Each structure stands twice: as structure tokens, then as C-alpha cells.
Design a protein around this nucleic acid. Structure first.
Lengths: 60, 206
RNA sequence: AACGCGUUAAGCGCGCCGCCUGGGGAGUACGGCCGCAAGGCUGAAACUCAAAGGAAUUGACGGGGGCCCGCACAAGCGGUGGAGCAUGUGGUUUAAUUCGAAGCAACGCGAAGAACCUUACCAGGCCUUGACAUGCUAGGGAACCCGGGUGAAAGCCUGGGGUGCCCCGCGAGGGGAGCCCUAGCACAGGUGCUGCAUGGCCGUCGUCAGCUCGUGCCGUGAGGUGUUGGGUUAAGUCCCGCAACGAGCGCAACCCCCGCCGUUAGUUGCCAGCGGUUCGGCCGGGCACUCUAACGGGACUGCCCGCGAAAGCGGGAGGAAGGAGGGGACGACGUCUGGUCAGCAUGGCCCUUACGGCCUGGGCGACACACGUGCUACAAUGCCCACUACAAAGCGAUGCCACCCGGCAACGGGGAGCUAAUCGCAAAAAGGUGGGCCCAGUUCGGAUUGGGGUCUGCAACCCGACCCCAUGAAGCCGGAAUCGCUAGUAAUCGCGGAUCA
């Protein structure tokens, strides 16, 4: 149940409580950000290539 | 274990964003989804010319897709056959005014993401991998540079023992910031495994 | 062969003697000679092995030596190990209690959000070209929109609105590009096994001072020199030496945060100065302060004294700051057949009315027990009540909610500001002040169970969070053991954020 699920995520069946998140690149269920629509990995991969405007290597 | 992406380590200086704009916190979300499925579609139908970069600039509904290539021909046709169908295709998902360009790479041997794909093609057609590497490095430094490096992963020759093959010339200080070192990586895909190639070009300084 | 030998030959030669012919069996048995005896000299075989051995590399190791490091010990402060509870794991249990991680480097770890979702597990009802992709054949149907019955839902049965086109066209009508109902074929789907078939990404040795290349020179060769040595450094940092002279990946340097001052800019700041103030920087006025964020200056052992061949070490002044000024990001050739096929990607293997797919209920939350990480404590340098101060970094449109009204309160009715240095979360808390407790299992401690309520959600029995009354358990400082931290650190106090009903 990997493919059947990412497709279940899109539809919104009965009771809106069921509507979970899900990563865009990665079928990722856990660790999924509102701002980017992405997973923790998916994100970090991108951020190094510059495909995310102004998301820079932090340092404080 | 370790060694970080040499692009992510530059961003602030040297390397600039391969997608630069601004957007709000209901919209980054969406403008980002777009930018992938764009670069996703281009990656396919355009491999033929060797798209070593795919910039995107923006202000409001106005996309500045600039494709950088060493062999520009393949993208247009003679006069305008191909370039036509793409403009169509792009805005075929985005109901916005798709403004596509092309730019030239004076020397493809000095564009890493190319150098990587070249060697990944050489492997997919079973050539001596010790050689292909030692050779692709001369190609680069030959055509003027200060330093250059390549790395092929495991299943060399299709052997049940996966190794890792190296070789590189000049200087490559990946630890230094005032550097400018172009990185690219390609997937060879075979009957027995899945190799990986990494390419590094040392260009200028101060 | 190398280590070495070298007129005291192991060199070059001649004479005569003794001796070896792979390892174990075995210096044994038998016979013989000798011996008081113990035993000695002479000395096999069957059977069995793929080697047994010499010198010399490069490592690794030592209950070897030398120089030197690190909260390693030592000096010191606060903790776990004991209680009660929260959380992760072993085990037993179970219809199932899904899988992974295993000394350091697994165990508040994947999990930055399990009531159905999740969800990979079990019981029960169903569905097959399938919930998703690409393409072909065939009559209907070619978009689409609303109900009926049955059921736990899923599913299966079933009643009504009816099509803007290329175009024969007044019209019957008819070719038809989307897109979907249905049969059927090529195919989809699998978190099914293989992290010793793999990519990528991560852990670790270790932020340790190392790991190497080219040429030359040395050795029959593995390999060596360079990169051993003296000085010095956080450092293969630098100096000086030298059959070597250079060079690369490293360290350092360039990049970000905190410190001091300038230049640029004024809806945050300011009686700083006169001005009116219902005394609220509220007001006109004003960038001098404060702040905000953007470009700079400033420190280089440059100055002086001493020690030194030099590198550099110690000491003094100016200075907001020195001898890497305080924190970051950054982690070499490689090691652990390390971790991950369950984020994804991927060779091979295996299942294709089910090892695929949908729902309803359960399970992941079980409990005679065992270990790890944690929270609240056993009290007077304390606990309780009223009043009163001083932060930072962040976050907010079916979001944060000012301010009202009701309720003991949780909350609930109204409703202004806000795209947010202009409104909101918002009170920080410890502290300060004055009132009560008086050494007690207590006004210490808040586990457990009874009763009563609120809010999210379709739904809180298994399983949610809060609020109120009543119950007030064990704990009077913890056996053997065992962790952290060298300065704005330890200790202690509260605030925010990701995930998200």
C-alpha cells in the first residue's frame, strides 16, 4: 500500500479529520512542512541546489 | 559518511540561485510545485542538447525560463519548428505567459553537469571506466582550467563487489569559499546495477 | 637470499676427514654392543601431511621505552541507580499486540503529533485491467448533474436534468475533437525477500594532524628518502637543517552571529530644548539620543623592553578589543561487508479474482516481570495568598483576538484593531514587598479512585486535553554501581517555534 495511498491522500472522502498531509516529491507521510509542501529530505536535497529562492545556509 | 554539497556551501557568494524570485506564505508552496514540473518536463524533452542549467526569474505572472547549452541548435530547429511546440507545452499546464530563452556555453568541457553526463553515457555503453575518467579530466584541464575531479561509484564492470573509482588533476579546494567550482552528477542505469558520477571544475579565484 | 663476513674471511685456491637430501611418526620400536641402575651409542617401518622452514618489508599489538595531548583522572558543583509517574526497549501475552535500530556509534531513536485517517498487523464484508500510468479493439456512452433502495460502511441494485462542435444545414440528419460509463487485450499494483548485488544521503574513528603525488637518488625485491632529526605551534604552523627539489588533498585564510566607532536613511525613538498636554511622546514640532538595516573603518605581535641564529616565547603602553578576541558553518586518504530496499532511486528473486485494492471494527495503548532516557518531589536558602517590577527570539485571515457581558472556572455569547516595528499571542518567571504556616508525613508531596462539567471532532468504551468538589498513595535524600560541566559555563527560572482539528 504505497501507490494506492498517495492517491488516497489527494481525494477528500467523508469527515475532513481524515485529510492527512503527504510530501510532493517523496510519498512521505511523516515530517511534512506547510510552507514548502515537502519532506525533510526532499527539502534538504533542493536547498543545496538553489531550487528554493533565498533559502540559505544558516549560521548564528 | 560526510562531505557536503559544494553548491549549498557557496550560495551566499559565488553560486547564485537557479530559481530567484520572491513570494508570500500561501504562494511559495505553489510557485515551487510549478517550478519542478517545469524543470521535470524540460529535463526529458531536451536531454538531446545537454541542458547544463535551467534558470527561472520572475516578477508577477511573467516567467523568465533561460536554458543554457553548449549545442544551442537542437532547441529551435532551423528558424522555428521545435521552439514552437515547447512554448505551447509549457503553458499547457500554466495559464501564464511563458517567456522561454536560450544561452551559450563557450566551452562544455568547463561545464561540470555536462562532463558528468558525458561519462555516464560512456559507461552505459560499456567502456573502460578507469580510462574514460582519466581522459575526461584531461579534456577539461586541456581546454584551460586551474583544477578538476571525477568519481564513479560501485559495480564497475558489473562485479558483485561494488567499488569506487577516483582520479583528478590540478587543485580542488572544496573547503575554500573564494573558489567557484561547478558541480554536476549523473545516473548511469544498467542491467546489473546503478552507478553514480560526480564532477568538479576549478575555474577562477579572488 | 638477506642480516652480515671481510689478513682472527663467511674472499680467491689446493689436500684429507665428518656430515645433509621435505614435515609428523621418532631419536621411538626391534635387534645388537655397553651400563650396578638410571640410561647411552647404533637406529627403522607402517600410517599420515601440502607444507614444515631462513632473512628482510610494511603494519597491528604489548601487564616495552621516550616526548606530548583531551572534563581522561585529579580539584570542585549539580545528578541517575531507591519512591511515584511520563516515555523507548527485553520478555511474556495475544486473533493481532506491524516492521526496523543492538557496546561506545540501538533504547524521548525512523516517529517535528497512532481515537477512524495514519497504518505496513488481525477478525469480519466486498472489488477485479484494478485506487494510479501508457496504448489498441468494439456497439452503446461519447463532457455532465440530481436523487431511490440495501447495507455497519465499502459495495451492489436504481429514478431524472441531456451536450456550446469540424459541419450536409430552412430541416429531417449526419461525419466528429475533447471527456466518461462497459466488455476485452497489451499491462498496472506489492512497506513481499535480498543494505554482503547497489546509488544517494547519514553515523563513527576525529576537528584528530595527518594521507599522498612527480621527478631525482638508494635496495635483487616488497619497499625507502621526501614526510627521521634540533627549535616552535591548536596544527605536516613556521623557522633551521638535509640526496633531495617541488607539488596536491588537509589545517589555517576567504563566508555568517556577538562585541567599539563612522556614513547613508527617518510614522520606532526623543521636554534631549522652548511649545500647548483631557498628563497617554497624546499633540504641533524635531533626527540630537535609542533602535532599525545597509555600506564602511578598526588589529598587522605594526610600538617598546627582555630571551633567541631564525621561527617565535615572556613582559609593558595605547585600545571597545590583541597574541586563534567569544561563539558558528566547514570535517582529509580511508575504517566499521557500519546504517538505510520502510523517504526515494535500483540489479536480482518471488506473488498476480491475490503476497494487489476498498471499507467497517480491533491492534499498535496488552502486564507476573526486566533495563535505558526523563518529569514531580521528600521541604524553612521552604510551601501558600494579595500587590508590584525588568526580557529575547519568534508567530499570526474561515489566524492571533483587544474590550465587554455571563459562568466558581474550563469555557461561552457579543465584537474593535490586523496583510502586521502602527493591532494581537502577552502575564515572562525567579525576583521585590507584606500577610499566613512553625518542623509535622505537615498548609511538605501530588499518585490513586468516586462524583460533576467544558472544548475539538461524524465519533473520545477500549484510547484525548482541560476545569471544579471530594479522596490525599509511595516517598524523611536513595545497595553495589554510574552521568554532566572549566565562565556568562554548571546550577536555577520562565518565553517562543516546527508537527498540528
Amino acid at each position: 500500500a504505497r501507490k494506492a495511498l498517495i492517491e488516497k491522500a489527494k481525494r477528500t472522502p467523508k469527515f475532513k479529520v481524515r485529510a492527512y498531509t503527504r510530501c510532493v516529491r517523496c510519498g512521505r507521510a511523516r515530517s511534512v512542512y506547510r510552507f514548502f509542501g515537502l519532506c525533510r529530505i526532499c527539502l534538504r536535497e533542493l536547498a543545496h541546489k538553489g531550487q528554493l529562492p533565498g533559502v540559505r545556509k544558516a549560521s548564528w | 559518511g560526510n562531505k557536503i554539497h559544494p553548491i549549498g556551501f557557496r550560495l551566499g557568494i559565488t553560486r547564485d540561485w537557479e530559481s530567484r524570485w520572491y513570494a508570500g506564505k500561501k504562494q511559495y508552496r505553489h510557485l515551487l510545485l510549478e517550478d519542478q514540473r517545469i524543470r521535470g518536463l524540460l529535463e526529458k524533452e531536451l536531454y538531446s542538447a545537454g541542458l547544463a542549467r535551467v534558470d527561472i526569474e520572475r516578477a508577477a505572472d511573467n516567467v523568465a525560463v533561460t536554458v543554457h547549452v553548449a549545442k544551442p541548435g537542437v532547441v529551435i530547429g532551423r528558424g522555428g519548428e521545435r521552439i514552437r511546440v515547447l512554448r505551447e507545452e509549457l503553458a499547457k499546464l500554466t495559464g501564464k505567459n511563458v517567456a522561454l530563452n536560450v544561452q551559450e556555453v563557450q566551452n562544455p568541457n568547463l561545464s561540470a553537469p555536462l562532463v558528468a553526463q558525458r561519462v555516464a553515457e560512456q559507461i552505459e555503453r560499456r567502456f573502460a571506466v578507469r580510462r574514460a575518467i582519466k581522459q575526461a579530466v584531461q579534456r577539461v584541464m586541456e581546454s584551460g582550467a586551474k583544477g578538476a575531479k571525477v568519481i564513479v561509484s560501485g559495480r564497475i564492470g558489473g562485479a558483485e563487489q561494488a567499488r569506487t573509482e577516483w582520479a583528478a588533476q590540478g587543485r580542488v579546494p572544496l573547503h575554500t569559499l573564494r573558489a567557484n567550482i561547478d558541480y554536476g552528477f549523473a545516473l548511469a542505469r544498467t542491467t546489473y546495477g546503478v552507478l553514480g558520477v560526480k564532477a568538479y571544475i576549478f575555474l577562477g579565484e579572488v
